[PDB]
Amino acid sequence: LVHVASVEKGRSYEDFQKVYNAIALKLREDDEYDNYIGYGPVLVRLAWHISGTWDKHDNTGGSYGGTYRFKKEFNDPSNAGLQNGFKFLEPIHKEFPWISSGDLFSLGGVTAVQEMQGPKIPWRCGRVDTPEDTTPDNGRLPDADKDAGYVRTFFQRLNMNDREVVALMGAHALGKTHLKNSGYEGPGGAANNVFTNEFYLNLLNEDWKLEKNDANNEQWDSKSGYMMLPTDYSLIQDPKYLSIVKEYANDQDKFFKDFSKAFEKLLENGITFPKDAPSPFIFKTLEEQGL
Numbered sequence: 001l002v003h004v005a006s007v008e009k010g011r012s013y014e015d016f017q018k019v020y021n022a023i024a025l026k027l028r029e030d031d032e033y034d035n036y037i038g039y040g041p042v043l044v045r046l047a048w049h050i051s052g053t054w055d056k057h058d059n060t061g062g063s064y065g066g067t068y069r070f071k072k073e074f075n076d077p078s079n080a081g082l083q084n085g086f087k088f089l090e091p092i093h094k095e096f097p098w099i100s101s102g103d104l105f106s107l108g109g110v111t112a113v114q115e116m117q118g119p120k121i122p123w124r125c126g127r128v129d130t131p132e133d134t135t136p137d138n139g140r141l142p143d144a145d146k147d148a149g150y151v152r153t154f155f156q157r158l159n160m161n162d163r164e165v166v167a168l169m170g171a172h173a174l175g176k177t178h179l180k181n182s183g184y185e186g187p188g189g190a191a192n193n194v195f196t197n198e199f200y201l202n203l204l205n206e207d208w209k210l211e212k213n214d215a216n217n218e219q220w221d222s223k224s225g226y227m228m229l230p231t232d233y234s235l236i237q238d239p240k241y242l243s244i245v246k247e248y249a250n251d252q253d254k255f256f257k258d259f260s261k262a263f264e265k266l267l268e269n270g271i272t273f274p275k276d277a278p279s280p281f282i283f284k285t286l287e288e289q290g291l
């Protein structure tokens with residue numbers, strides 16, 4: 001399967017910076033969502049789940065085709081709750097009908113991270129919508145109730161190495177789990193709509209307790225009111241993973257630089273970019289724009 005990136009006709013940097021600003025302005029406006037967390041965390045979860053379907057062996061799935069707009073992927077049980085990020089973006093797509101679905105879903109994730117004061121993520125345009133029959137089947141996204149060997153093995157299919165996996169998981173500092181979407185409940189920290197290295201700090205410094213929640217699932221709970229998934233707590237149970245967790249709890253700039261590289265790679269897996277294709281764009285935030 002080859003997927004060649006094709007720039008939307010005649011569009012350049014300035015066009016996509018208008019779509020960025022449109023998403024970013026609505027993230028500021030629709031601030032009441034999910035008890036004032038806002039839409040940022042569900043938008044970086046949407047960009048990870050449309051990319052997380054990729055398989056390195058046959059190049060199926062991935063962010064290229066925008067296939068989450070089809071019923072099969074939209075109704076995957078693993079995507080429960082992401083309908084709220086889709087409905088957030090649907091006004092912006094009506095306003096910029098020329099951008100492809102894969103490009104809009106991945107740029108929403110980029111925009112949310114930068115606007116929540118994360119690191120800059122280089123983004124490349126050129127994803128092309130593909131037919132309903134190209135939609136990957138349900139079951140390619142990871143279970144939460146498993147251990148470190150499961151996480152290591154699952155992520156080799158997206159070929160992410162240990163460092164990449166631990167840097168990517170730092171995004172679970174954002175937002176929260178919702179019992180009616182996943183059978184898990186609670187946030188992982190105090191700052192859950194500001195991008196920081198707090199996931200690593202809480203994992204190493206809180207007193208975690210294995211409890212059962214109302215959906216009868218086990219999760220790690222702390223006195224402070226935070227929670228960690230079984231696969232999150234895995235990172236301090238494995239010796240290779242644990243020493244990268246310590247590196248990111250002790251250096252927020254290294255965490256930001258490694259997250260940026262692994263999130264761009266996540267979003268770009270499966271896509272062939274021609275050498276006459278433009279460079280990755282670095283978008284300015286509303287703040288750097290005075291907007």
Ligand code: HEM
Pocket residue numbers: 041042044045048080081142143144145151168169171172174175176177178179181182183184229231263
């Ligand atoms: C083995 C890996 C992973 C598993 C099993 C997993 C699982 C989950 C689960 C069960 C939730 C709760 C969903 C809900 O109830 O609403 C969640 C939320 C979230 N996840 Fe993951 N995840 C994984 C990796 C990642 C990665 C790699 C990213 C991003 C780069 C990510 C970003 C998020 C975000 C931002 C939320 C919060 C969503 C919200 O607030 O609504 N996840 N994750």
